[PDB]
């Protein structure tokens, strides 16, 4: 609704699904742009979360920055799989490398979701202390 964190989390899952059915339609050189996208919508998410942090229990902020760091890591793994899919286009490891790329992005989305729950849940434990 008026929840930005929710929205960017949805923008980012959208970006992950596009990527899914558009390696099929893209050449190796283009895989850079798509991930660049997923990266950018992610920065927007991680940014609008970074904005909330101040107003809530530190006990949350630990585990929240946990899933944030987790996402950065998730991106990195996606980027690496993408690099591997470029280099390995035109070799027998082409498909597997792409398969890996999808999985990297998949769990990227999943962890984006878990970021949201951690936020929703921390938003609550905040409201009731107050």
């Amino acid at each position: 609704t008026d929840d930005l964190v929710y929205l960017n989390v949805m923008e980012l899952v959208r970006a992950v699904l596009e990527l899914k059915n558009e390696l099929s339609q893209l050449p190796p050189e283009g895989y850079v742009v798509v991930v660049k996208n997923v990266g950018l919508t992610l920065r927007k998410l991680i940014g609008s979360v970074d904005d909330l942090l101040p107003s809530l229990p530190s006990s949350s902020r630990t585990e929240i920055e946990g899933t944030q760091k987790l996402l950065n890591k998730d991106l990195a793994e996606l980027i690496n799989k993408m690099r591997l899919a470029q280099q390995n286009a035109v070799t027998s490891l082409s498909e597997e490398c792409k398969r890996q790329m999808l999985t990297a992005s998949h769990t990227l989305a999943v962890d984006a979701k878990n970021l949201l729950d951690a936020v929703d849940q921390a938003k609550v434990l905040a409201n009731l202390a107050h």
């Binding site: 929710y6 989390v9 899952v13 699904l17 899914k20 999943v110 979701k113």
Partner: peptide
């Protein structure tokens, strides 16, 4: 609408 996209993943 998130739950929708969420399952579309699989």
């Amino acid at each position: 609408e998130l739950d929708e996209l969420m399952a579309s993943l699989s």
